[PDB]
């Protein structure tokens, strides 16, 4: 009867899952958000959002605690979906996937410039020199050149670039297409 | 436009027309 | 507590089912089956293989990325979110067709005289959350603003009135 753990861990691979948390004889609802790390080929530790039953109304969940990064607008997501009125299981999953969608977007952005480390691009070796927590400002070396880019968090578009300190436009555009713009 | 805001979430809607740019 | 954790996981999956068969993980939804095979040496994934019994073309972009990156996380979420959006498209298309002179022209297209409105889900890689794109063969800008103002259903219906 231990196949359950095997079944669950398989579900957890999806990245989003609900689970009960018992504390002080109250059953909290936990939202588990797990990201896969393509560099380590492992899953990172889960982020958590914890919901507590309301003591004021029936059928209402409330935000109790969480450890999501500060760039996740967790309270804007909760208000927009629930209005502090409808916290149905369906809305909670809508809220969970909305936070997870934003986590993946940032995660994938940082992972992109770290996966390029060591790889060769345009017969030139890539080396990452700096990247902020949100992957919106990046500096990397390609051969003997130094590229610095500023990214718009909304559309993942490279909006500003410098090539060896000089303004550049040939590398602008979607962030994940920069590897195809070096031929210029 | 509450309906559109909910549809954007449910459908992950992306409009073809970008109203942040000019329509020339 | 065992049974309550399954309750929450059943809620998580909703109408999707997950099953561990051999070293594979099967994602089922009414005869649809997505098979995920992973090889876990030490505590890390070294290889992955995906097999589908339907929507092979619709899922090729994101599934191709996941296999090229061994990212089972993006793979399984993309299938889950794909099954969800496709059902939402069917419901929305049906509501518009039944509530207006729009008629069902194909799986993803509705027509009103020479006006064509098409519903599309496409992968904005590497995101496993597909995006909805509603296209028309006439004035896209008017449709988009009406959708922006009144939402998908009313936007499309009101747009047909402008023709």
Numbering used by the authors:
A (entry chain A): -1, 108 to 290
B (entry chain C): 319 to 342
C (entry chain B): 107 to 269
The authors write:
One important inner kinetochore assembly that is conserved between budding yeasts and humans (Schleiffer et al, 2012) is COMA (De Wulf et al, 2003). COMA includes the proteins “associated with microtubules and essential 1” (Ame1) (Cheeseman et al, 2002), “chromosome transmission fidelity 19” (Ctf19) (Hyland et al, 1999), “minichromosome maintenance 21” (Mcm21) (Poddar et al, 1999) and “outer kinetochore protein 1” (Okp1) (Ortiz et al, 1999). Our data suggest that the essential Okp1 subunit is a multi‐segmented nexus with distinct binding sites for Ame1, Nkp1‐Nkp2 and Ctf19‐Mcm21.
Guided by this observation, we designed an Okp1 variant (Okp1295–360) that, in addition to lacking Okp1 core and segment 3, also lacks segment 2—the Ame1 binding site. We determined its structure with X‐ray diffraction data extending to 2.1 Å resolution. Only Okp1 residues 318–342 are structured in our crystals.
